[PDB]
């Protein structure tokens, strides 16, 4: 009702149901599942076994599965639970009745709704050029798949221009306005991933050098995500950013993200482990969140990742995204004329807020470190029959029940 | 003086040398410190800057020199200790005075030495075919690069024959004779890896699924890597494997490792996180470790990894990888012949021992969980001005001053 950062998510065609489920290793247990499946016309290549990585005597099921097999689930689920003897969660992307929302468990997963984004006023609207520019650009997130290298594309002088002209103003506010977190990977961002005036960097480059440090990654979007597609990415330490850059008429403006947002506002500050562990929190607590608590999680990351205000001792500085590629909005949140007030998840989870730039409020961080386990609490409250946490090596989301 | 399972390091024509430090940020100190490298006649692009992962306010500094810098490395580090103010440790390939025995930080730098590797008897020395495939999968090896999807190679009947009448025999014996931990992953490499008995696996398919299990990952080396580098990689559950398969002519016997003692010795283990996590703490233990206690360490993996027996309960089943590739001794360990000895890594460290088949003595351990501890404090005895430690994220040794 004010235009909210939250955007809900959708279901595609044939949408998306996994099974989670642990096997205990008994003599033909292994087969009696797999027997189940095929049993019941279901292609065993969806259905994946590997070692429990808690328990030493048990198999992890992954289940790559669709709408299609809903008409025989219910039995298998049956079967499993009461026949063979397995704890099962069922989850499903229509998040219905006695369903936990559905998210990846394997960071390939990630591609599912990858491709699952939502003019006029828009300027590049009456551009020809600009729209097929941008079709370009969705045309690569579309095709992109997790693991491979982000296709680099040449920009042009004008879209470099742009480039520069919000560079310039942002690189000479960051010494004032933004954390030292920011104003401390910025310099090695600008000496090896090519961020400088007259150079847009290739978001290959930035993964890189992200990975390199945080281990984050990204992931071209064509644009908007839900907020349970962009927050679950978070979980696997991954940045779905666009790589398109805004119209050159307005270059001071944007109604939506676009590179120059998501390189010099959200990856300077992936780089630092405390942020990336911070944002990844976020994400882990994300999912399989009911609806209700994304969109909170959307409201928390809003007044955090996106504008948020970090305690620097006894000053105040900006960390939120939204803030460091916004050199308006970024010189308004320290003025006098902002309200400020301490992180405190259970009142920001409920806060009121508008896109429109120029926020009234802003919520002020002791420290990423602090802000982190103060998810991890928020989390803890979050209706899930699970506890989730991820698991670098393997990349894989490892569900153990509540603690 | 019995040959060991110690392989002594060289160094190739250029070896290796990288400088560990780490920089707080204080205006000009980065440009300092390249200023310095830049001065002194070295690519910059051999050094490289990244956020530090420990401390908020300090660069990493990763330096990818060799031999032909030394003349200036000296300056340099003065400069860097007593000018700008900077701990610096020298790792050096060819450890000399004052120099800390090299070992890649980055998992890619496992490059560098992967193709360091070492005929008459062996069976296939008269065999053209043979020598020649034998150069087709070194050449795979010397060409691969970390990173790479490792390339597939199409078995000739004969090969998959051999490799057959290997596998039949020890499928046939685990589960009387391996640990829980490798009967719990077989069926599991068998259903999902190609492991079957007319049928050699691919080392791609298999990097997958070990990596989906425990992130551990395999790279195809052409032969014998030094005991310092093939203890190394695993530091970053990094798995040097060989490719091809021994002769035909005598398919039950090796005097060297090959594609079937790798597979069915190594693999299945390596799928475990409690024995990857033991494993990786020896490759942990041997970084920078001096040449004694890399052969030391090499010794104690000779009597784990390799040759070791796991206690299970009452009874005594063995998980040492030559083991369970090695019909004829894997039946004889748990024999009334061998001595036993429970595994204590300083009597087992400085242990006799020869290549030989049929061990006289085997050590057994309480689970991999109390060999790794074990190995854990075993480490903390060898002589290194730090300790190490493997961040999977950004798959990186992080280095920490001794704890
Ligand atoms: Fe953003
Ligand atoms: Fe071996």
Not at 312 to 340: N, T, W
């Amino acid at each position: 009702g004010q235009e909210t950062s939250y955007i809900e998510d959708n279901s595609n065609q044939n949408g998306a149901i996994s099974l989670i489920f642990s096997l205990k290793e008994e003599v033909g247990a292994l087969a009696k599942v797999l027997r189940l499946f095929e049993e019941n016309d279901i292609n065993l290549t969806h259905i994946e076994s590997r070692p429990s990585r808690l328990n030493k005597d048990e198999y992890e099921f992954f289940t790559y599965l669709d709408k299609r097999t809903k008409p025989v689930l219910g039995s298998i689920i049956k079967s499993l639970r009461n026949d063979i003897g397995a704890t099962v969660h069922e989850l499903s992307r229509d998040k219905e009745k006695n369903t936990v929302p559905w998210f990846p468990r394997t960071i390939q997963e990630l591609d599912r709704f990858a491709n699952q984004i939502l003019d006029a006023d828009h300027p590049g609207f009456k551009d020809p050029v600009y729209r097929a520019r941008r079709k370009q650009f969705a045309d690569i997130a579309y095709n992109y798949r997790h693991g491979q290298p982000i296709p680099r594309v040449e920009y042009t002088e004008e879209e470099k221009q742009t480039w520069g002209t919000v560079f310039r103003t942002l690189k000479a506010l960051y010494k004032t306005h933004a954390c030292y977190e920011h104003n401390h990977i910025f310099p090695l961002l600008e000496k090896y991933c090519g961020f400088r005036e007259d150079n847009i960097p290739q978001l290959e480059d930035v993964s890189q050098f992200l990975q390199t440090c945080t281990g984050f990654r990204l992931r071209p979007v064509a644009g908007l995500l839900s907020s349970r597609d962009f927050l679950g990415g978070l979980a696997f330490r991954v940045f779905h950013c666009t790589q398109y850059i805004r119209h050159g008429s307005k270059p001071m403006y944007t109604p939506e993200p676009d590179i120059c947002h998501e390189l010099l506002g959200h990856v300077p500050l992936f780089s630092d482990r405390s942020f990336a562990q911070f944002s990844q929190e976020i994400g882990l607590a994300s999912l399989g969140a009911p609806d209700e608590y994304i969109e909170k999680l959307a409201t928390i990351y809003w007044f955090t990742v996106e504008f948020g205000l970090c305690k620097e001792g006894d000053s105040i500085k900006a960390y939120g995204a939204g803030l460091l590629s916004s050199f308006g909005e970024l010189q308004y949140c320290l003025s006098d004329k902002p309200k400020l007030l301490p992180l405190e998840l259970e009142k920001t989870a409920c806060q009121e807020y508008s896109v429109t730039e120029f926020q009234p409020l802003y919520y002020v961080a002791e420290s990423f470190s602090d802000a982190k386990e103060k998810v991890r609490t928020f989390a803890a409250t979050i209706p899930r029959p699970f506890s989730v946490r991820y698991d670098p090596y393997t990349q894989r989301v490892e569900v153990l029940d509540n603690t």
